[PDB]
Amino acid sequence: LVPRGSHMRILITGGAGCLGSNLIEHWLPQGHEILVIDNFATGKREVLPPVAGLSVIEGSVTDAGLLERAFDSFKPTHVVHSAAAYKDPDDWAEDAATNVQGSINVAKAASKAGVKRLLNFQTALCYGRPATVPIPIDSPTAPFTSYGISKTAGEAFLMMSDVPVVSLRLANVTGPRLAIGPIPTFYKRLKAGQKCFCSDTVRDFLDMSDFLAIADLSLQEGRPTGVFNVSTGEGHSIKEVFDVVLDYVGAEPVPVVAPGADDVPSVVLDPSKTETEFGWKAKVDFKDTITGQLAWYDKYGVTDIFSHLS
Amino acid sequence: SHMRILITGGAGCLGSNLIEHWLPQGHEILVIDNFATGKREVLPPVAGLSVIEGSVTDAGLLERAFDSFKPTHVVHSAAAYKDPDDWAEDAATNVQGSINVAKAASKAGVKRLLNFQTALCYGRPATVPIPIDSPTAPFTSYGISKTAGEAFLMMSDVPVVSLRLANVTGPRLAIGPIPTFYKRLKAGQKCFCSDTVRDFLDMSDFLAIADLSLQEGRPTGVFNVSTGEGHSIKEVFDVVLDYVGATLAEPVPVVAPGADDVPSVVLDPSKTETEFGWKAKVDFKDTITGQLAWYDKYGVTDIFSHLSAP
Ligand SMILES: NC(=O)c1ccc[n+]([C@@H]2O[C@H](COP(=O)([O-])OP(=O)(O)OC[C@H]3O[C@@H](n4cnc5c(N)ncnc54)[C@H](O)[C@@H]3O)[C@@H](O)[C@H]2O)c1
Ligand SMILES: NC(=O)c1ccc[n+]([C@@H]2O[C@H](COP(=O)([O-])OP(=O)(O)OC[C@H]3O[C@@H](n4cnc5c(N)ncnc54)[C@H](O)[C@@H]3O)[C@@H](O)[C@H]2O)c1
Ligand SMILES: [Mg+2]
């Protein structure tokens, strides 16, 4: 039915996570039909209320029969692959099963089911220690952690698919229900009057609204396929983030501390090919990105369970 | 210098040739193999040799093998590759299998783990001969899963050597251009050579570096194993023609390489020479000729054992 001429039946793996739930909140009010598959390893049941147009299967992308049955009953036109394992750096076996084998399973099931477009999200950890920052899209993959090695292979399998695939390599995305990293940490700590420390690292940040716009473009028939960096292309230090929080919240000068052994000095993506090929560009700058995150904390707390669905 | 060696994939070409080299020296050897491609004939019931039939994907089986056998050394030679559409098997054997082998070896406190890597990990190289610090950029099921496998092994606390190998020739090689030209030329069938360049390594040179790799105090990490010289498939053909003594009814056509066929894959072994002091001794003509001489004696067979069975 609606939206007229472009109703999607969207199968979203990992739909109970941050990105998944934010996409559901974006698409469901438009009339799209959504099916989520999640094992609740990190995602939350509370972000998936029993509303019309939304179904939820508690299961794993590693379970290939659960997937064939779900693709067969639901008949999606589109797939968003957002399921990932990462929480235990030493559980290589779970990373490989979810991130490699689960990607392969989704790919095979999508191809059989005839889906029009498949959207995957890739961690910038795929680049490992880059030689060039901002990282060009044609830079090699060079992961050196369980999460990066497994995601790298996952993406590589997906790119062999006969289904048109977009894999978005992502900046640190901010928005509703983000509850980890420097933004919430500096916010809670500064309100608690606790000592903060800034890693001596450059990172990039993307506002949820800009993430949503490229996700929309990525699922349109006829649009480009392949791997794409999604960023403003600007990098900001952890200290710069801290400074925005401090001023926002209104509290000895903060020490610049690290970086840890496995911490890459600078990770900032070059989005130039994505601008060219999609005509997309990130509209929300750094200050507004962090500020809107902090504004969300003021209203709902540092929580990962506040649903904007009725 | 007595070794208790656990060899996964020991029924295959490299594994079985290793066993023939090491078992006469008094080493105790356990093989784990699922016989996907390796043959039961190459592993006779002799003193010093144990065979468990099973998969590196089976974490339970592996734990029980490492516990009972207590290896001092591990040679990880198991790989899946035969069906390029069977991504799930490639990922299970090559990624999960490598992870199970790494974890089990770590737990059992092995002195040294030896891995073999396909040059498909390099994808389409930017520089030939391929430097050892070149990126991994695989684009096939076999190259992707093996790349991930090796990367997981490199995260082990056990000392690891991973050898990126030229095309190894020796007893029981029954695939590739060498046996194909030998058989076809003797039968009067038309041959064609792809216009590609490759490297070839005699078994004797392979045994030498494998030996060095298993010795305490030796270097660790990734290494290219090669003469460092490349030869076209036409050059291989030419050696086979002359050796077989055939007369051609038309010149061999040299044809443009396939879609997925990398034009030139030759490895630069300099770091291996620097750190190991190893250098490949057998030149191209002698390497090809030694393969053809083996076929003259035994035929193109992968079931002839050089071990003396009771
Ligand atoms: N949020 C970011 O800024 C960011 C940056 C780079 C890449 N990514 C990628 O985007 C995707 C979503 O990230 P997120 O930030 O929303 O994280 P998230 O932890 O909130 O993950 C999404 C979900 O995956 C689920 N999951 C894990 N294993 C599963 C399994 N085997 N079967 C089904 N579901 C499973 C979790 O329960 C979770 O809800 C991931 O692939 C991640 O690697 C995110
Ligand atoms: N021979 C070469 O020139 C060459 C070149 C580069 C890399 N390598 C690497 O060297 C290693 C051995 O190669 P090969 O030429 O001997 O090939 P091979 O096919 O003869 O041997 C691989 C062996 O692994 C076994 N196997 C497959 N899946 C298994 C599983 N799940 N559990 C246990 N065993 C399993 C097969 O039965 C087979 O005996 C492989 O890792 C390969 O990728 C070989
Ligand atoms: Mg092989």
Author numbering:
A (entry chain B): -6 to 244, 248 to 306
B (entry chain A): -1 to 308
Sentences from the study reporting this entry:
The wbm locus contains three neighbouring SDR genes (wbmF, wbmG and wbmH), all of which have been annotated as nucleotide-sugar epimerases/dehydratases. WbmF, WbmG and WbmH are all homologous to Pfam01370 (NAD-dependent epimerase/dehydratase family). The abrogation or reduction of O-antigen expression as a result of wbmF, wbmG or wbmH mutations implicates all three genes in the biosynthesis of this molecule, and is consistent with the hypothesis that these three adjacent SDR genes catalyse the UDP-d-ManNAc3NAcA to UDP-l-GalNAc3NAcA conversion, which is probably required for O-antigen synthesis.
The C terminus of His6-WbmG consists of a loop that stretches out from the C-terminal domain to interact with the Rossmann domain. In the WbmG and WbmH structures, the dimer interaction buries 1316 Å2 (5.7% of total protein surface) and 1562 Å2 (7.2%) of surface per dimer, respectively. His6-WbmG and His6-WbmH copurify with this compound from the E. coli expression host, but in order to stabilise the protein in solution His6-WbmF required the addition of exogenous cofactor, and this is the most likely source of this molecule in these His6-WbmF structures. The preference in each case for NAD cofactor as opposed to NADP is indicated by the close interaction (2.7 Å hydrogen bonds) of an aspartate side chain with the 2′-hydroxyl of the adenylic ribose. This side chain would disfavour binding of NADP by both steric and electrostatic repulsion of the NADP 2′-phosphate. The SDR triad is conserved in WbmG and WbmH as TYK but in WbmF Ala131 superimposes onto the Ser/Thr position. The active sites of WbmG and WbmH are devoid of amino acid side chains capable of acid–base chemistry except for their respective TYK triads and, in WbmH, Ser176. Structural analysis of these three wbm SDR gene products also enables us to distinguish between them in terms of potential catalytic chemistry. Both WbmG and WbmH have the conserved SDR catalytic triad (TYK in these cases), which suggests that they should be competent to function as oxidoreductases. In both of these enzymes, the pocket that surrounds the active site is hydrophobic and featureless compared with other SDR enzymes; the lack of side chains capable of acid–base chemistry indicates that the functions of these enzymes are likely to be limited to oxidation and/or reduction and probably rules out specific 3,5-epimerase activity. While we did not attempt similar modelling experiments with WbmG and WbmH, visual inspection of these structures indicates that they also have spacious active sites compared with other SDRs and can therefore accommodate diacetamido uronic acids in their hexose-binding pockets.
